[model samples]
Target chain A: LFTVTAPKEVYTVDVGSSVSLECDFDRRECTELEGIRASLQKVEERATLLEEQLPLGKALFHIPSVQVRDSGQYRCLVICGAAWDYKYLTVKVKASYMRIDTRILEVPGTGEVQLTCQARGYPLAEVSWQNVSVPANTSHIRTPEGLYQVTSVLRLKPQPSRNFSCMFWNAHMKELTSAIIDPL
Target chain B: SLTFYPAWLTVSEGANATFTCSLSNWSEDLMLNWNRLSPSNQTEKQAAFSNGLSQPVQDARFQIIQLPNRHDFHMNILDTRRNDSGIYLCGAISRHPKAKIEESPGAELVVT
Candidate 1:
């Protein structure tokens, strides 16, 4: 049987940075060990599995770029000889950047148009639309990279030339990011 | 942009599984396609199914129904098997106007 130990149970990485976790197993005490496998699985989501490989005596879990969605408990399991050893590591990725975009969808010959704004940010940013005569509908969805994609839409008739803005605010950033759309 | 309804689906074996893909701001006469990411990490693409007088793809197991606006693509998988369980992605492609393509986030499907 093999017994595994992790040097650090928790790790933190800044957004867009790389992180490596180590899993040390003492198999010297295990005798006549056959085949071995090491695997890492994300908990509570769709059970997305990440990089897995056979390690000689230690397993390294590496993430090239860490995002907010990568923040959670990761289960590392190793099956060697007749022993199954496992450990949990908590990874936290700090929030960083935000992106925003705005568009105007106009119907042919109609004085009415739909104003749409989308914003993406880590740590679930706040989004809002401005300079609209009517109320806007907004939705927030989590992206695969552990970021937030917020969308807002409004329908109205704008004059010949006008500017509308979409604003995005996040925790890590000092100033809010905005996207402006001009209707012709 | 494309969006898929029911981001996650769990269905029983031998049953029917359906997914709806919405193409927002659809304008060009582009053809929509459905691709499946197999458990083995292989990709399979098929032309989307249409409701009106549209013929099925080379494979008949998949059925497609389009909404009135022709922007919503509804796909149905008949006689779902364990092999049907995987991630499905929807996208639109157009050869004209410089071959533009947009794909939605993958939706996971699990068949028990």
Candidate 2:
């Protein structure tokens, strides 16, 4: 049996920052160096070949300017002389962006209007109208690469010259992004 | 309980690979089986072992073998192609032990 150690099991980093994950092993554990190999994996996403050093019994995985898509569990696999051990690491990335879309159409006979608002963002942004408390529905979905996608929609019968705004803001309380449409 | 050695394996194309699965607290009526999940989410039964006898199923790339005294199920894949790479799971079932069945943790196989 082989033993593997990870100095930092979990790490948190802001966007545009750098991080290094280290894995160390005992030199005397596996006498045969030919069978020694190391690998790093991003949880269930994919396996990555970062870097390895056999003589020093160390494996290091480095990420530069980490993005929101880089947040997930990272695992290291070390195989030595028919025996193997693994170390797992978790990375949390703090980043969020917003996108808003809107479309408006006029009902011909009734002299009414229809408005659709769609917003998507990472880390689940909260959405609301500018000055109205109309009932709105928000749906949250996790992307395949470990990011968040949010969609919000609102429907209303508008008065002339009324402005409909959809605002998106994340948990960090960063600057808000919004889209406006006039359904008059 | 059933367990698999080397929870993950990485190999190159056209390389050979082997996996071993061991059973603990065995029963006489227990039977072992091997299954492979393709990268496209398709599952295929590769082999089976029962009553000290080994049987190979649909796929010819996999061969089932038993270690002498370890009572562990072993399998070897020769000239592994890119499509042969996926997760392998070892399963055990027994009717004599009150209808018990368990599967070991999946061992991921990545073929580059």
Candidate 3:
């Protein structure tokens, strides 16, 4: 079997974390190594050849600081002599932190306000309105630095839930961060 | 092997074309991701769908069409461009207990 083998099919790492992705084929199957070509590309986008090593049948792509927008399918293509095969690897970046952006204290307007919070992560963390309110909308914007700015807006009510709080949970429903609105 | 409907499509420019990937034994634990390889060899991430919800994409021209009670991840590219002529692939990513990525065979689209 001359197929390339990836040790891990998926990698879930925190934002700015350094990670390595590698794939290799059995060396015994091939005789020559002079013309063999190996590359790591982010699917259809250009190849991320940074720090890529094609020594023997192993291919390594090292990303020192990964961002949320760096999450996607990566193809490890190994063309050894006459035959070629590939393995697809996925990278998922999570937000390192989160915070509530809405200013509070006195409720302006019609005693109702839009509560807002944001977490920089991939897929935009699932927001839970612990203080209780319907979600107005949520948006996940890919930041220029390669992570996603996950912002959520909530329709606020100045009733019992005056002490507002919002929690950011990842794709697994695991809590990553949370913030509370101060009435004072 | 993954099932891709209309594996090969040849259409005129500025026409609506739909790509379909039937997810077998699909469930809430997996998210559907769609990608496109342009004629210029550019790979672009289109949209991702999970739990009856999808992450927003940059291009509004690319849309995901929900087929009620269906296990297929259907995507519609509005007014297909010449550069859209390439292969479209569907991927299913696992969410819990570590992660696993599974992808479908490419569906080639030829736009005139």
Candidate 4:
């Protein structure tokens, strides 16, 4: 029963740049005087790297000149020298704004078109497809690495005068994420 | 995002109440177990009556229900008391050992 809980957070880094992996104990300690160590494991390779001590220290798990090899799975663990608690993180380095991996299915010429919003991010991102002329539905699924994906589906019954949009946002990053399919 | 309704619930003491856990398009016979979240020392053994049969759960005060469609699970407190005032979590147990529980957002109930 570890007292230190690392609530999930997202970290984005650019190529040839370094991103610091932080595990904050928040000065939170266990019931006993046991110390905690935080570490991250690369899921694909099953390789583990120790981050740093908590409450103040930060580990530079440097991804020098980040390449596609760095674009796999990562899980952070809080260890009491050995006993631990952990969470998963998936890192992706991209040159452009993140892709909107959604599908817009058959749009009736005079009716609404059905579309889905899916954003893949570490520490689980929150997505909302709202305020458009269309309606939406959101669902949750577990990824292979045990993280979560929130998929929001938008359905717009055709309105000739109005246009529709999809929005995606997480606590760390906020951008006007939208995709417009032609009027159905 | 998987959101839970009535995240905080208040109920009359000694009354039967149902705590709801719901998910969209999330089916499959995932392991779903419910437990106490706060006071931080509770084990995963508090609400384990999830055998596939239709027998009543063991605890008279706590009753858990896993529906057939794999959509939602409800926790029915038969004889509620002030002791039941903590966070109760109902989560799906994944097949993988390393991934035993896929947690619901969580529900906090207080029986006055």
Candidate 5:
């Protein structure tokens, strides 16, 4: 029996970056004698996707451009003439980003203008006005791209500086990011 | 959002424990999976998955009660053992290959 190993238990990458999940097996010198092959598969039951192979006695699932939804548990199956083995690896994608709508909304009843922000991140994002610490309206959703979209609205008047910015706090990721509301 | 009822549970050894997943507005766009997060050993292949019928999960003691009308799945562990103590979470995976997977807060299972 031979031993197969997934080099990393988990690989973390950002959206748009390239990453590879690798697995190697012992008995490298004998693949020429008995022959060996490898393939990759996602673990979820209703899983979809395909595998990629490489040279040597190793299997490589190389992703050229990573996307948020490309995160999941992947299995590398290796087999020789008579022996077989497999290992599992996980991929995590991150999108620590935020944006705000420039066009302010009118409260209609009080004629008050509101600033809205949509932030993308993980473990959900807590939004707050820059230089204006306040608690107000907020909503969250798991976006189709696998990012957590946090939307928040703040009722306010126009800033004297004509500049509005939002700060996103992704507590789970321990990350802080900001976005400016374009007034132009 | 989907969640587990009771939040937590405790049961005696050799007893049966039931964990309920509550999805108020279930949709075909997503599929549900029950995962054992703690005491985790390669996903506890034994507790992996099974329909109410002929056991698909490695362990015959685990049963999946899928209730479409109630929009819930009751995962029942029969003849519970102390080793079964751990945290479990219900996950809703989107049908679209490139979509996201949402999870319910974990429910801790205490077997005494």
Candidate 6:
């Protein structure tokens, strides 16, 4: 099996501070280092490449605007002239604060409506939402990179459209919710 | 590849176990670490070992055995239990000629 010559196994850094993650190749420096690459993505986010900076047998990881969503497993793969070798890195991001965005959708004139909820946190947290009777329409909750976006929209059928609410949760704290739009 | 002793070995419960990963002729600017992954949870624990033979933080069951080469290092688990049964990971940190730091697949240890 191949070996990692540089990185140990884990790398930790503060929320906003800059971080340098490094990695090294094993015994034989594979014949063809091309097609060899490093793909990293936060816990629940999209995958990005450190393309311009790879196949060096040894490399560094740098993050300027680090956030909580900037943490999780970092894996490295080496594609030799033959088969490919692999290595994994774990990044722990500790964020001090978080930001959340949510919206509400209501029926044309009735009390029925859809409630939405979203948030961004360090170590990324779990998110959920609910209304007094119905839930918000969540068809729009989208996370391009699985970074830290939880979105849910509720749709009320009719007769009752009481209170609309959304919430964000994690190991550290709980955001009960930021929205409770009463019927118009 | 990193050289290590007891390339392969078996140990019983309550016994002590030590696994090592060593590098040769490495540059001065490099990052190194060791990892322990549980079989059941696949949960991973990564701890920094040494940099250019620098003094690393002391760990309970884990230790960094420094040699003249400095790349010689090992992870020692104290009071081995069935829970310790799983694969142990060892790797290094540096620049990616093409991308990120490269790594080797970990060695597996079976705790009876």
Fnat for each predicted structure, in order? 0.00, 0.00, 0.00, 0.00, 0.00, 0.00
* Best of the two (3, 5) by DockQ: 5
- Considering the two chains of model 6, state its CAPRI-style docking category: incorrect
Q: In every candidate, how many clashes are there?
A: 1, 0, 3, 6, 0, 49
lDDT of 2 at A130: 83
Interface RMSD of 3: 14.4
Q: Comparing to the true complex, what docking class would candidate 4 get?
A: incorrect
lDDT of each: 0.66, 0.68, 0.67, 0.52, 0.64, 0.53
Candidate 1 pairs with clashing backbones: A69-A146
What C-alpha RMSD separates each model from the true structure? 19.0, 15.8, 16.9, 14.0, 10.9, 12.0
lDDT of 5 by residue, B27-81 (tens): 6655455667533233222232222331323467776677767577787889999
> Could you give candidate 5's per-residue lDDT for residues A51-130 as a string of tens digits?
32333566776788888777777766554443344556787767776454444676677745678877667556787777
Q: Which candidate do you rate higher for lDDT, 1 or 4? A: 1
Per-residue lDDT value at B92 in model 5: 55
Q: Give residue A165's lDDT in candidate 4 (0 to 100).
A: 59
Query: Which has the better TM-score: candidate 2, or candidate 5?
Result: 5
Q: What DockQ, on C-alphas, does every prediction get?
A: 0.01, 0.03, 0.03, 0.04, 0.04, 0.04
Better of 3 and 4 by TM-score: 3
> Cα deviation in Å at residue A145, candidate 2?
8.2
Candidate 4, residues A1-184, lDDT tens digits: the string is: 2323334345565534655554433333343334444456665422233433343433224454654346655645444332233444556543322566767676658465677767654444556654664446777776664445668877767567665556655543444455554544
lDDT of 1 at A92: 64
Error of 3 at A19 (Å): 1.6
Give the alpha carbon lDDT tens digit for every residue of A1-184 in model 6.
Answer: 2334334667666666876666656435453566354544232323344555565465456676566556777665443332233455677765422455655666677765555556644445554545345433433333454344555556665345455455555554333334554544
For model 2, what is the error of residue B46's alpha carbon versus the real structure, in angstroms, after optimal superposition? Answer: 32
TM-score of 1: 0.36
